[PDB]
């Protein structure tokens, strides 16, 4: 969600209007105001095609975080637009481990809260204790208030 907003902070909206133009060219292919399973089929066999069905049924059932249950119009749009590659730095293992050192300042492989709190406070931007609640759910996959590294990894892998 948030990512949507940052990327739109990159560029402006007139762009989006001409996108809409491109799409009047495309938007043939909603069965349900959505672009769902049969629409995936329809607009993709438009050229006799469909995504690698891992992608396809993935969109059907899985990437529904919300309980959308289906490929919405939004979800087929999601695949078709996440096409062009732009993510930054996706930070991960060796990063996240050297980080985990001061994360688990404990020197133990099990972070405590306030080392992470310090890192949060000293990032350069906003720490919602909502998001800290998120992170306790996430980071400590054990959720025992103390995090083995890989837990923190998948908690922090793959993001700017």
């Amino acid at each position: 969600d948030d990512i949507y907003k940052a990327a739109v902070e990159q560029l402006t909206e007139e762009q989006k209007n001409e996108f809409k133009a491109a799409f009047d060219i495309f938007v043939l292919g909603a069965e349900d105001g959505c672009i769902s399973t049969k629409e995936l089929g329809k607009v993709m066999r438009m050229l006799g095609q469909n995504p690698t069905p891992e992608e396809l049924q993935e969109m059907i059932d899985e990437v529904d975080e919300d309980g959308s249950g289906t490929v919405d119009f939004d979800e087929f749009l999601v695949m078709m637009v996440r096409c062009m590659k732009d993510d930054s730095k996706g930070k991960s293992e060796e990063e996240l481990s050297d980080l985990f050192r001061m994360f688990d300042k404990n020197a133990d492989g099990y972070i405590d809260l306030d080392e992470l709190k310090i890192m949060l406070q000293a990032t350069g931007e906003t720490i919602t204790e909502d998001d800290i609640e998120e992170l306790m759910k996430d980071g400590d996959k054990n959720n025992d208030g103390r995090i083995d590294y890989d837990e923190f990894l998948e908690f922090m892998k793959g993001v700017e």
Binding site: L11, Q15, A22, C83, M84, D86
Partner: peptide, 12 residues
């Protein structure tokens, strides 16, 4: 993408 689109990809 570009292989399927052409020159419409210039600002990015």
């Amino acid at each position: 993408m570009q292989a399927l689109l052409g020159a419409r990809a210039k600002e990015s």
